[PDB]
């Protein structure tokens, strides 16, 4: 049976960074579609893009640095082939921002800061190589710690609704996850916002919490209708707070009234039913 | 129905630190019982000790440092009362070792290293206060990054089978999770070992993977017999690799033959059945 984790959203984690969920929100009116690569697990558990099954892989990079280039591997130590997705599994998916990664090694001391600019030509995570940017030689495992305004183009401010250019220019098939659109019908996408550390009120959006991804991947729901109508139940009282709908590509949408930013975070998404994709939602509230 | 995540162990995470699982092993012969506080979720989903439901809280501390003491809060920002367990939820559970924590802030830059000695008198996480050890004033969220040999008693080497002295001296009830023992019958406890970064081959043992904890917490299995016989199935082939048994306090035990360190990590613990606690196991192999 298809099921979503019966845990409060306050207790789950974002799927694009290892962080607690702080809000449920919608996208700014300038952003129609988003193309996140992490946090992309269809309702039948088929992980697409660079989404791992556990949070111990989310926003983590492992590889061997030559002093000039980090040859990326998978996090298990084995080599990476462009065959899987746009980058090694769990690769950070934050566009319009500079990454900052805490790097450690098995067998050594002394964690080290790794500042990553995702615009330059040498950032080609599809060819299994990112720029070292001063990280010394050796095998490293790093996790995303905090983000910053991008270095290029200077003057632009953080837009976490984009994804980094994964290289893989004209000829190759990029294995990028397909864009997800608002299913039209006066319906807007719903994003789980987690507070990212960074010089500003950074609310990182993810399409599904990570525990949701692991539950869908471990469950592998055989049956998917056109969409899955959800309610956001408040566990202390048991009153429905507003209906959402999950589309099979693994996102939730809702029609706000002016909502979803007005909903609490201590609720629980209970899978209500299987609905058609034309099914009309009641506004949030 | 009681179910364990149908994901390979290589893809799950340790419950005492945010790390991938690398092996399945047993305890040294000098260690009979272990008293881990993280990674303690009974088979009916009752989280005990300082175990959180998501990995976004495991081995994380949040609090306000006065320059001399970190007044610990819960990770959601709300104050901490000794009422829950021995320390705030998700507090690190690594005994016999010095912690090292990467600390960040919402709204600021510049991650900072926080070195924690768990022996001194001012390390009283039950009273909601640990030593600042140079961490500047302010509200911080930190995650465990790497470990080290303890500073006291000097000369002792890493023994990850202990837990830190959580303060809470003679009078108070410490809310410590009860010790878990080998149930006898020649059975020995089985530990999921993850490689911790640190100046040595640190294999951190946990009783259950974190995704197991979240699945048991979200599922809340109503029915628990005396024990749950498990098999460790290899997913590519489908051959059982050796039987374990899960006791209701949330651990697995097995009789080695000389095993469980000989088993691969790409298998999947499938809950086989409900057995009595006297049920005799076949040796690993």
């Amino acid at each position, epitope marked *: 049976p298809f099921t979503l984790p019966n845990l409060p959203l306050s207790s789950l984690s974002n799927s694009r960074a290892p962080l607690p969920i702080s809000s449920i929100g919608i996208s700014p009116d300038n952003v129609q579609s988003v193309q996140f690569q992490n946090g992309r697990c269809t309702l039948d558990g088929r*992980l697409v893009g660079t989404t791992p099954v556990s949070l111990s892989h989310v926003a983590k990079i492992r590889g061997t640095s030559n002093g000039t280039v980090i040859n990326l591997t998978e996090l298990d130590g084995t080599p990476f*082939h462009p065959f899987e997705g746009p980058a090694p599994i769990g690769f950070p998916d934050l566009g319009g921002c500079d990454w900052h990664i805490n790097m450690t090694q098995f067998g050594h001391s002394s964690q080290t800061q790794y500042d990553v600019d995702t615009t330059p030509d040498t950032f080609v995570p599809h060819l299994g190589s990112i720029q070292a940017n001063g990280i010394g030689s050796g095998n490293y495992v790093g996790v995303l710690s905090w983000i910053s305004p991008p270095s290029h183009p200077s003057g632009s401010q953080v837009d976490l609704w984009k994804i980094p250019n994964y290289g893989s220019s004209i000829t190759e098939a990029t294995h990028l996850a397909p864009s997800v659109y608002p299913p039209g019908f006066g319906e807007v996408l719903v994003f789980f916002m987690s507070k990212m550390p960074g010089p500003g009120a950074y609310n990182l959006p993810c399409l599904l919490p990570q525990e949701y991804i692991s539950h869908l991947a471990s469950e592998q729901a055989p049956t998917v209708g056109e969409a899955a109508l959800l309610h956001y139940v408040d566990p202390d009282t048991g009153r429905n707070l507003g209906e959402f709908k999950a589309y099979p590509d693994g996102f939730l949408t809702c029609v706000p009234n002016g909502g979803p930013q007005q909903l609490p975070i201590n609720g629980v998404f209970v899978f209500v039913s299987w609905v058609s994709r034309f099914y009309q939602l009641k506004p949030v509230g | 129905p009681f179910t364990l995540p149908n994901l390979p162990l290589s893809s799950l995470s340790n419950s005492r630190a945010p790390l991938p699982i690398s092996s399945i092993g047993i305890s040294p012969d000098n260690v009979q019982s272990v008293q881990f506080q993280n990674g303690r979720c009974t088979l009916d989903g009752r989280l005990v000790g300082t175990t959180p439901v998501s990995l976004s809280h495991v081995a994380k501390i949040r609090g306000t440092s006065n320059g001399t003491v970190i007044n610990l809060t819960e990770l959601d920002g709300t104050p901490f009362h000794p009422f829950e367990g021995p320390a705030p939820i998700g507090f690190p559970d690594l005994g016999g070792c010095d912690w090292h924590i990467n600390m960040t802030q919402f709204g600021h830059s510049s991650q900072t290293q926080y070195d924690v000695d768990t022996t001194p008198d001012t390390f009283v996480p039950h009273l909601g206060s640990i030593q600042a050890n140079g961490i500047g004033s302010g509200n911080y969220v930190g995650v465990l990054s790497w470990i080290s040999p303890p500073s006291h008693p000097s000369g002792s080497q890493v023994d990850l089978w202990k837990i830190p002295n959580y303060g809470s001296s003679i009078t108070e009830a410490t809310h410590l999770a009860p010790s878990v023992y080998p149930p006898g019958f020649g059975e020995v406890l089985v530990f999921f070992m993850s490689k911790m970064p640190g100046p040595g081959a640190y294999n951190l043992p946990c009783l259950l993977p974190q995704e197991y904890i979240s699945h048991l917490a979200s599922e809340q299995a109503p029915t628990v017999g005396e024990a749950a016989l498990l098999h460790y199935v290899d997913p590519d082939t489908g051959r059982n690799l050796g039987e374990f048994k899960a006791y209701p306090d949330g651990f697995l035990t097995c009789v080695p033959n000389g095993g469980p360190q000989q088993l691969p990590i790409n298998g999947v613990f499938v809950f086989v059945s409900w057995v009595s606690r006297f049920y005799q196991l076949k040796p690993v192999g």
Partner: antibody
Amino acid sequence: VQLLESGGALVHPGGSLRLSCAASGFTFSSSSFSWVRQAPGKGLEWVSGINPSGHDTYYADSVKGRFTISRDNSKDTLFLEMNSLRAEDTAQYYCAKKIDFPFRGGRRYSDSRPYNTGSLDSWGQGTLVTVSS
Amino acid sequence: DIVMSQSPVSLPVTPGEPASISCRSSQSLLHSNGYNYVDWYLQKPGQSPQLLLYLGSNRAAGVPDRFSGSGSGTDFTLKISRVEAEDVGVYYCMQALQTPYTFGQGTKLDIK
């Protein structure tokens, strides 16, 4: 992925030897391995192979019944013992790790994907076994 | 079992000019999944074999885009778009469909 092999030495025809391949830098427990050999001046020839659990071992017809492949998951080691050697087995022996693909969804998804695929991504440097008198 | 013949035994090429190494299998290497379970290995002079291509056309870790896999069914072509000096060596087409994994006699790609 580093795979270091050792044990190759001159063996009397009919003697025995034991070649070990110690692995470092990756989860050894979840990787399939294979022993391949290159005769001096000839092409590559695949000798044997072993799965992660070590219960499935495959042998070439020229060495079936005389070579034994096994693995110690604890010490991260792969083993090939050789009994009743012949001069035909004079060759350099490599331990190669078969390609792996990240989890990516489960067995409903992965049984239509080419994940077995036989291909050897990482190789060791081989140890030379000369069988002579 | 599967015998993998190759052509030619030696392929003399000039640096920069695209080279085609054919490999023909006695059995069809087209699997039901649509992938050709044929790998292309490069053993350079004095080194251990390294995987260039796997599953017909896919490139391994660190393989530049000049190596291409073409062909299907039973006959496959390693196409080197711009032969460099780093590519000299013996190219083996290994069947990966079934054990015993049989390698081809190899083509000694040499540059003019």
